[PDB]
Amino acid sequence: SHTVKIYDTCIGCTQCVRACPTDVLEMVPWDGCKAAQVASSPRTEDCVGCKRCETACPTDFLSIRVYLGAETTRSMGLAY
């Protein structure tokens, strides 16, 4: 599948979790930021490489990044 790296610069905006359409992302509590939560990607075998999650992240530069890797059936988006 693909590879979703989440760096430590995000603010817990929850805009990337509310944009990944296969629901790869979820918020875990983390005492760093002001909103006290960081995005996490525990289900990256479902990620389709959409990069909706990189489009919705505010921080410059992006705290979330999708590295396009080996493409299985779930990441090609094939109904067949």
Partner 1 sequence: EKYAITWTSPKAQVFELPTGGAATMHEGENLLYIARKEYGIALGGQLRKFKITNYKIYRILPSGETTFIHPAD
Partner 2 sequence: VQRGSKVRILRPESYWFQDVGTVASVDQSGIKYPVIVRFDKVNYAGINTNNFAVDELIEVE
Partner 3 sequence: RVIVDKDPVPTSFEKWAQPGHFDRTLARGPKTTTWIWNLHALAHDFDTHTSDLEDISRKIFAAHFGHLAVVTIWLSGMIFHGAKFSNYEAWLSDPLNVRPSAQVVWPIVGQDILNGDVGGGFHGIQITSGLFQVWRGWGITNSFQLYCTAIGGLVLAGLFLFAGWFHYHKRAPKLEWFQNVESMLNHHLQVLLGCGSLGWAGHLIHVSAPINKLMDAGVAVKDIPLPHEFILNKSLLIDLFPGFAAGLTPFFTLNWGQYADFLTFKGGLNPVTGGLWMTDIAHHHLAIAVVFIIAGHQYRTNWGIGHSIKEILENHKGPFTGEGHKGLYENLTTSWHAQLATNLAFLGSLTIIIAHHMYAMPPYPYLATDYATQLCIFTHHIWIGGFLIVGGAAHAAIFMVRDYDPVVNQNNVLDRVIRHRDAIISHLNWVCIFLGFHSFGLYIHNDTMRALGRPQDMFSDTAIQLQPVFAQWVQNLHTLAPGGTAPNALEPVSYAFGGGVLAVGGKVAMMPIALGTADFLIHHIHAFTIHVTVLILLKGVLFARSSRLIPDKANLGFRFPCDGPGRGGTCQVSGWDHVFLGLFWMYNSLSIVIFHFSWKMQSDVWGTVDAAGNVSHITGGNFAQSAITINGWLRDFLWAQASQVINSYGSALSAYGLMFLGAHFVWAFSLMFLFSGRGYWQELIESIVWAHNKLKVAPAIQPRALSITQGRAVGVAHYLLGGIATTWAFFHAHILSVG
Pick one of partner 2, partner 3, ligand SF4, none as the site partner of residue 71 (Cβ within 5 to 8 A by kind).
partner 3
When CB distances are held under 5 to 8 angstroms depending on the partner's kind, the choice from partner 3, partner 2, ligand SF4, none that residue 6 binds is: ligand SF4
* Residue from the set 2, 12, 36, 40 that interacts with partner 3 by CB under 8 A: 2
Three-class DSSP labels, the chain: CCEEEECCCCCCCCCCCCCCCCCCCEEEECCCCCCCEEEECCCCCCCCCCCHHHHCCCCCCCCEEEECCCCCHHHHCCCC
Write out the residues near ligand SF4 by the rule CB under 6 A.
Answer: 2, 4, 6, 10-13, 15-16, 20, 22, 24-25, 38-39, 47-53, 57-59, 63-64, 66
